[PDB]
Chain length 474, copies 4
Amino acid sequence: AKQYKNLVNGEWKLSENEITIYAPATGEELGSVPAMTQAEVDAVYASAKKALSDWRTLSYVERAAYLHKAADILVRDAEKIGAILSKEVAKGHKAAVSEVIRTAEIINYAAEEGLRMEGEVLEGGSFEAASKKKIAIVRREPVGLVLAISPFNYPVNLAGSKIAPALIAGNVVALKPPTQGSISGLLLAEAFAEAGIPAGVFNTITGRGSVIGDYIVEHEAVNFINFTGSTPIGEGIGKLAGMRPIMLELGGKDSAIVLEDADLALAAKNIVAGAFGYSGQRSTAVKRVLVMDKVADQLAAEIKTLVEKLSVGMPEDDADITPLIDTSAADFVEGLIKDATDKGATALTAFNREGNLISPVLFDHVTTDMRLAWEEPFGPVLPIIRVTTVEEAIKISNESEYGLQASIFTTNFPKAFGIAEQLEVGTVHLNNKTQRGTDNFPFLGAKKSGAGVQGVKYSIEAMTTVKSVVFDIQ
Amino acid sequence: LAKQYKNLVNGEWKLSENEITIYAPATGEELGSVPAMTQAEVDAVYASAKKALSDWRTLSYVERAAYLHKAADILVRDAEKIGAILSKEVAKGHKAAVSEVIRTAEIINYAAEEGLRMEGEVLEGGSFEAASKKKIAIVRREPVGLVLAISPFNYPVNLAGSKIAPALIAGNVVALKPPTQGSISGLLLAEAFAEAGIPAGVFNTITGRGSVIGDYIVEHEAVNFINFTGSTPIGEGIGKLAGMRPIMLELGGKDSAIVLEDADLALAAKNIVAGAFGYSGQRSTAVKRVLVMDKVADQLAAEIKTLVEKLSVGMPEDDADITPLIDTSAADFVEGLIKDATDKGATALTAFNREGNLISPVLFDHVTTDMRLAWEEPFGPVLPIIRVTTVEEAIKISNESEYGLQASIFTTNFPKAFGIAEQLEVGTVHLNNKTQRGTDNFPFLGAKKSGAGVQGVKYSIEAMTTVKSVVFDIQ
Amino acid sequence: FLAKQYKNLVNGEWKLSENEITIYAPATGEELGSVPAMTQAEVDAVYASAKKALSDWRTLSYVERAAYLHKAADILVRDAEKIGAILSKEVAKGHKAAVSEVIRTAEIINYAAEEGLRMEGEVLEGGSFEAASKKKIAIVRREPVGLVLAISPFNYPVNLAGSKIAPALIAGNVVALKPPTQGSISGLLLAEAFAEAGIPAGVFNTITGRGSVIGDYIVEHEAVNFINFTGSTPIGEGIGKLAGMRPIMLELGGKDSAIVLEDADLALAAKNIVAGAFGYSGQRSTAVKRVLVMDKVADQLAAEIKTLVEKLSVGMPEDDADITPLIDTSAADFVEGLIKDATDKGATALTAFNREGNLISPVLFDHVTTDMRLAWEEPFGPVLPIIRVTTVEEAIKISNESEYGLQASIFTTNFPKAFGIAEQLEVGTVHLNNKTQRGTDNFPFLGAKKSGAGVQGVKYSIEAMTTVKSVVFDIQ
Amino acid sequence: LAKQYKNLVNGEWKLSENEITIYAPATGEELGSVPAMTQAEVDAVYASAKKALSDWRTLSYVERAAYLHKAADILVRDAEKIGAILSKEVAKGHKAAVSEVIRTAEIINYAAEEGLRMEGEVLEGGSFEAASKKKIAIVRREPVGLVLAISPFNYPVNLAGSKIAPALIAGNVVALKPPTQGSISGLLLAEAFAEAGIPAGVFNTITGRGSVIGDYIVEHEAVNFINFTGSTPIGEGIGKLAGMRPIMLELGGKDSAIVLEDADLALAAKNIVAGAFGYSGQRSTAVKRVLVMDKVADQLAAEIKTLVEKLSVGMPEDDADITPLIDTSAADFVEGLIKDATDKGATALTAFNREGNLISPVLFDHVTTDMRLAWEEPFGPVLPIIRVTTVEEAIKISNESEYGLQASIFTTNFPKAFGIAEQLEVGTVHLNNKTQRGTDNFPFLGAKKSGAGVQGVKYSIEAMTTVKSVVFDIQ
Ligand SMILES: NC(=O)c1ccc[n+]([C@@H]2O[C@H](COP(=O)([O-])OP(=O)(O)OC[C@H]3O[C@@H](n4cnc5c(N)ncnc54)[C@H](OP(=O)(O)O)[C@@H]3O)[C@@H](O)[C@H]2O)c1
Ligand SMILES: NC(=O)c1ccc[n+]([C@@H]2O[C@H](COP(=O)([O-])OP(=O)(O)OC[C@H]3O[C@@H](n4cnc5c(N)ncnc54)[C@H](OP(=O)(O)O)[C@@H]3O)[C@@H](O)[C@H]2O)c1
């Protein structure tokens, strides 16, 4: 264990108060993180706005060089960081190391994407003959101070996915990690500090989101809020933003649509991998199967066999299903499972709970009257909902308040493309599970799944504006 | 003559039980009445739009463009007829009002052709991860859905069409809420789209005073996007009611004209006067404050003065440069700014005079930062000259404004001007010319309280679309 | 009815030459009119006029250049029946198909005007590459290449003239159109529309004449900055020998394969194959010219295709027959020789060969093998071979063994597999479950290998005929 | 000492039965030998490349970029080792030669990252016709195939890497033919790619005598694209052999520096001398004629003279500004241009001297356009000053050249400079700076006899890629 500190203006600062963090799978004390005051928040933001000018006037290639160095340090320390990340969020050890490696990949890719963004030269004579000698030189500029707020389930990857695109464009950044996950966020900050990031260009803030969360968001030093987390918290940020630009990555209830001509064993393989990864604690993850009646019995059997084979255990043993993040999360999941059983759903795999380790539960004959048909569990439970027509599958899929991603399993690709056009989601994966990657692809959600478009180049465009200089050629 | 106007709702023209009478600001002549819609009538507009969306988005781009081209041709045909009423309704010079209609047709046509050739992206998984080299993402644009377009009094046709046409080409459905003062002109624009045969519900209008109906139309869950041009306080309120939904806001401006020691003063004076006093200063992009190096301030002020004195002051029907302001409260607000500036010691190079709401153009010199006129947007024919001692002071005063729409720099050192422009917190910097929204293909955006989002034709199309990514593995 | 003496457009005037070429309708021998037989000195005058006009033309706004193109398109629509009627006779194209060609030409001209007028430049940052250059920016704007020589083909003498002229003109180039001799009347009728639209003198000009007098001369001339050619592979190869350092675009021959897998919709494959293969009697570079069909479905597919080939009408252009007389006797002789080689080597004639004059009835062969000329050579006539293959790998191998690489069709219900096949096909475009085709004209059109060079389709053609001018300075 | 070098052929290092001994132009020192390949050995290079193409083009972008980054890291590691030999081989200053190698690594790394994130596009049939609204075209990038890259003696590593890396990232395979003088440097570059693990046959080298394989290399049917830098007459020969294969040509220049009456004359002189006399004038991009308004010509000429007199003249190992020219014929040619200018009455402001092939830097004033030096590319250290009385005359004289690579304009009036730039028949105009190829992300191209095609990193990648379209109908 150890006492961690926030990065503030190039200096590691403790706070009067602190919060102790324990491993959710064991209760092991992992350390403590500062509990920041509002004056300490003000100082973070003040140093950031002070460093902005010297940072934005650096060349793109100099800013990229800092990001590449930080990524190299993360790769070097992937095992040491991952070992702690695995404990802090009860994620499989290997999966935690992989998250660190993927973060380095995103940081490097953002550095090189951001140093070659488009600038435009527009001709007045495209619109009006009298203006044929007038041209507009349009160049991108940073928005200023970006507040990045990462979630517990990817506390390093979904911090880096915000930090690096912001920094390459010339923004300064403050990272508010989740409390459960704050040690991992501060370990990420260490890599940026060692890389030599100029004082104040990147800073961290730790403290209970339920105490300082509103304060850090409504502070007028913040020019942009980039948030990943729960839908209700995101909704609140959408109000406190006013006219300030934002990005919200919220909940999902991704549907896997399985048509009569699908490869059922292949559909089952992708569905189980996607639904039960990290115990279902992922926004982009198959959370409901909408399967045509004729093949539903066969598909359910294929899924059941796979779910029964999943390992259920501790993070150190790289179990497929690990303990959920906290007791409230496990209670909520158990509640959803109980509601489905009470309303008559068929439990194809057996429920069991030891501490907060819930064994994976597959339900068949789930109906739209059951909470599990709609609510995001963030736990290892998966409903199968039988449908009679493609039209009905589309209707049920779109009736969700969420619209992150969908999967379509079928051998008729032109038809699948037509269905994809009708689904109110950001991304449709054909014959594969839903996923955020690859990280160059757009990542976005409709409806209550959030706002804005991420993926690397899209994230950079979001956290920049344009400056147009217009003049007349003689 | 004075006609009773109706809203376009699901392809039909509909009256309401209550209406609003509209008078010409320059004469008091009654021009007609427009409906005062109920919340239930708004619900019907939105329901018809959402019902029409599926069949509209499934048309080809070229079919949607054909409707817009036909609407634009009708506007050109009726430009004189529409311009004459627009001129009376907002007290805009007759020829300028006809020009607004012609420009609207140009924007509609340009948006139709820009939007039909918007294309998508194919992204390679192998750009990022070797194991994903057979995975590609087919990324195509889609409409956001129902766009609520809210236009302002000063360009009630042009800044309606600048929202409607980009929205429609992309496959969105649209409800237009014009300004009450300007609602007749907005409904005249709607007639063109109806005559072009726009399918029922694809384009609709809503009228009923923003002070009464504005909050309900914005909060309504049917609306997927809000595209607003108007005052900063109204824009802020819309920002709150939008929640997570995308919005575009084009709000107030206090554009600075920075005049350096090496500037051509005759040309700077010409551009400053044209920009500051166009439409009596009732433009968000007007030159609204001169920041001039002291060593050229006396001669610049004198050359501006000579031009201000030559401006005609009269009625819209006579194509006067300075026409009566939109309403009495607007003229009172401008008079108050003039009074404040005079009380604090500014020099009135031209004399204040007011007959009804026709204020003569007032040029002030020696304006200081303690005067309201240095900061607040007047929306009237008054221009302050603020003297600075260094270019750094000009940058600081320019950026101290809460507004950040555009700026002008007058100088003969362009490399230095480019470096100045990089530091100005605005969307667009014009070198050796007045600020202006055009040409309409160029980006138009404002920093700080001047709004959110980027317009100009292609940018407005991109704003009112989202993307749909379809990912698959090649075998 | 009344044959006319036609003239070239040269510097805004209509000019005869001392000698001329009489053009006869291939289907009937009817004298249609004459076009000038220009001398090298007259070519010089065309090019001198063009280079003189280039200054005032490239400096116009995009809006002003676009207006001329839109007006020319409007005139073509107005005169589509009049122009199509003569085009039909000149190249023995069905009357309705010739009118359709004119209408399609107006569509491409209008689309090119609107595509080109909104093209943009870019601004690049020195600091993307080196910190010391962070204040250096490059303002990069588009410019024309100069004088474009556009050479159109007999089989689309209007459409594939307009596909070159309009992209060139919107970008600020000046243009000289050399139509094919058989097709020169149609090209000069197109020129009349641009002249009536008010195209400034010398901005657009025409050249007609004999290859033996001016053929190489028009291409080698130093005034020409770009050559844009559609025609046969051997003529294209010659233009490559004479192009030197100047950019060119070549749209040459094809032998497009239609790969029909076991899981294909065979009725749909047959319908598309026959439409693509026999349109304009097979006188198209983009056209199904060989069926590569998996053994298990070959009998069924052959029967479907046979039925549709038998329904094709064979006759005169005025009667809108599907199969019209070929462009000349040499072309028909060449086609007959390919048919005889296949017959003598044991291919099965599923429909009967007949020839009257240069009117060849449509011939479908089954059991064609790679030792037969018809497996490889582009006929430009109404003959189609079916080649039975055992695997998709063999279909890919045989398809890619061709010296041509224009397009391919894949008929299958497995699209992810079809994409994997398309990646291996050495062609410009692969159509899934559809015949090969140039359209829609916004899509890229290009040929690999001996099928051409460069990428057309509207925006791609404008890109090819534009360069850039960069202005670089340091911000202070 | 002097080593026998080998060609990289299908992952193996191959001598040939005959070789070419390479000597240092400044000293006569034997540097080593390169193989004199036969036509059958060229066949083996090309067969190896075409066999490697299938597995190379189907690797992921990231895998291809990783090889390029590794090659660049090795070049940086070995920059002195390679640069020291490059310096001797082409009589380039030692520091400049090492810097060339470093710049090559920068270009290789930048090309890898530019190329790996290239994208395809999806086009809508409904943009063009309603009946095709369900038809989409998935357009993806593909390599052209085998690129023949021919580097120049004056940048035998940098302008090899500028072709190789853009080709490779896009999935092309490459054969590099260095010039004989400059073949050792080319083979040293190849060693870096081989050590980086470039797969066998993906990158190969050809060396030999023109009399044996010169035309054969270019005419060979395996070659799909020719990318050449060199002299105009040699490039003209390549053009006569390209057939239908796409080419790119970077040929000669006669860049003008136009100096107007308001120019900063000290800045102009500094840039003019740096650009004109770098590498003894043996650069295609380099100020080669000053076109100066007569009112400022005396002062400009004096400022240039003072700088030219400071230039060091001597050996490559001593980083002399002016080193010996590439061979005797080149120096003879330059001496002839100098003599013609002297005999026709130009003023020699600095003195001509020749020792071996080391020519001292010669600045001429009062050059008239009947002098060969006004027009012919010298590739030697001689600079004419031509006085004009109007900008229009400067433009005419500039454009009268058969060359059109770059131009410089020195003036404080940028809107005017931009208008002049529009009229100059060149690829790039630099304002208040010498002409230069960099930064390497910017476009680099020549008009007229200066070449064909657009380079600079992303432009070079575009040039060596084509597309494959897959079109289907949505259901
Ligand atoms: N779409 C995506 O890409 C994505 C990815 C991952 C997760 N998610 C979603 O996020 C949810 C799970 O994440 P979570 O449990 O960490 O969410 P959460 O409880 O909303 O917390 C998210 C983050 O916001 C902070 N926060 C809490 N209250 C705040 C406030 N009032 N103002 C500002 N910030 C505040 C939290 O700090 P504290 O920890 O101190 O409360 C934490 O750092 C699920 O709904 C999941 O679908 C989405
Ligand atoms: N940035 C630009 O591009 C641009 C262009 C033009 C004008 N403007 C700005 O607009 C202002 C002048 O226009 P204006 O006087 O018409 O401004 P405004 O009073 O804000 O009105 C703008 C529009 O919003 C409507 N509205 C009023 N209250 C509303 C509410 N609560 N919710 C929703 N909509 C509501 C108005 O309808 P009613 O008429 O019924 O109240 C009108 O249609 C100036 O500040 C000027 O700078 C900006």
